[PDB]
Design a binder for this molecule. Sequence first.
Ligand SMILES: [Cl-]
Ligand SMILES: [Cl-]
Ligand code: NA
Lengths: 21, 21
Amino acid sequence: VALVFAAEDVGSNKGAIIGLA
Amino acid sequence: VALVFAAEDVGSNKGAIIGLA
Ligand SMILES: [Cl-]
Ligand SMILES: [Cl-]
Ligand code: NA
């Protein structure tokens, strides 16, 4: 967002997390 | 694995990661 936020990758799968800048 | 590794969720090209303890 620069900030690099970490968020849950909203999906049917295994506890994925993304780095949103 | 304790340690917490951020492995890669190869299930997308958006930078998702998986916590591997
Ligand atoms: Cl997920
Ligand atoms: Cl991804
Ligand atoms: Na992704």
